């Protein structure tokens, strides 16, 4: 019988992510200010 | 129709405990109403799922 201990798989393990991943999401500041201004305008009207 | 299946699974949890009395028994004893597979029962009365 051959030896049998805890070993990596023959092809190794798949890659593991470690780098930071904070996705970019949202609109630009121009869009936010335009929306905020238009909301107030319609409210006023 | 997926929320329909969620409600059906809850209702089958009621039916899967042998009625409302059995459903409330396991709700108030174990604080849980999941229906599992019975793997066995020991000589002391404990049931294992």
């Amino acid at each position: 019988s051959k030896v049998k201990q805890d070993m990596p798989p023959p092809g190794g393990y798949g890659p593991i992510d470690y780098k930071r991943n904070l996705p970019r999401r949202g609109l630009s500041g121009y869009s936010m200010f335009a929306v905020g201004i238009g909301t107030l305008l319609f409210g006023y009207w | 129709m997926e929320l329909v299946q969620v409600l059906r699974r809850g209702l089958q949890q009621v039916s899967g405990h042998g009625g409302l009395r059995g459903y409330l028994r396991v709700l108030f004893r174990a604080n849980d109403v999941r229906v599992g597979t019975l793997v066995g029962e020991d000589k002391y009365g404990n049931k294992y799922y």
Binding site: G36, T39, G43, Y44 | -
Partner: protein
Amino acid sequence: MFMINILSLIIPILLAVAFLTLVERKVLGYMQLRKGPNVVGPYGLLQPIADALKLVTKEPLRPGTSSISMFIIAPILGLSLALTMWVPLPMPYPLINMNLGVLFMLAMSSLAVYSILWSGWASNSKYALIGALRAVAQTISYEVTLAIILLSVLLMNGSYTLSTLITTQEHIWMIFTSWPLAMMWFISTLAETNRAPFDLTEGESELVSGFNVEYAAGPFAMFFMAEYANIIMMNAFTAILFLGASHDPHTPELYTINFVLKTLALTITFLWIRASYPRFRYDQLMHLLWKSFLPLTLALCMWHISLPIMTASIPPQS
């Protein structure tokens, strides 16, 4: 019959506070990948009862260095103010219908700062007094923005009558007309109820429990009830002020359902802030109020005085 009205206002509010404790614990638990109360009763529905019963049978240690007169007056004042804040609220029709309802709320909530100034002073211990002074300074500083924001918003209402807010917001929410003031008002309300990153007087990791260290069991419970009643009341005021619900005079239950749902949503947001942010420093929140909120509030009060005049959109005063 009016006495029955008072009772059927007060008692359900206290019950709502009791179960707000459970709701807050469960929301915090589920935001933290845990469950929260789910053993004591079905889904923890008997947990507030267990807490109330355990507290009233626990020994209420009173300090040896405590002026007991104010030591017991402070919870009475706190709870009486917290309850009386609901009497002008226009769930469709108010219990008390005043011309100056929101002025009445401003005054009553400004009297609530005494319950900390008296509890910290009465508890002695020479250190809870400093926390009480910090709490009082925070409260009075945010009273400024509360008052000015309320002033600017009500320039579309035309009066201090809260029933007129329903009429003002018939076609559109007041949020669509004053959203910046809405954000500043909401954060000011957060800060006034000593909640969220503004909970400096009861910093669990800053001063353990601050002004409430010496209070235990029963008086602690009543202080807690006062704070949570103030939380729900402030969220109800916010919903009525900014998210006015449509009113049917022949079906006021629809307005009540709308208002209750919106008040619950705002309260759940209050609990949502608690689970998401770190705590402001005392000087940091004072800087926020005095150098960020106050200039914008002054500018927006100016804007909201100018706006109805220059657009011929001044509301009626009746």
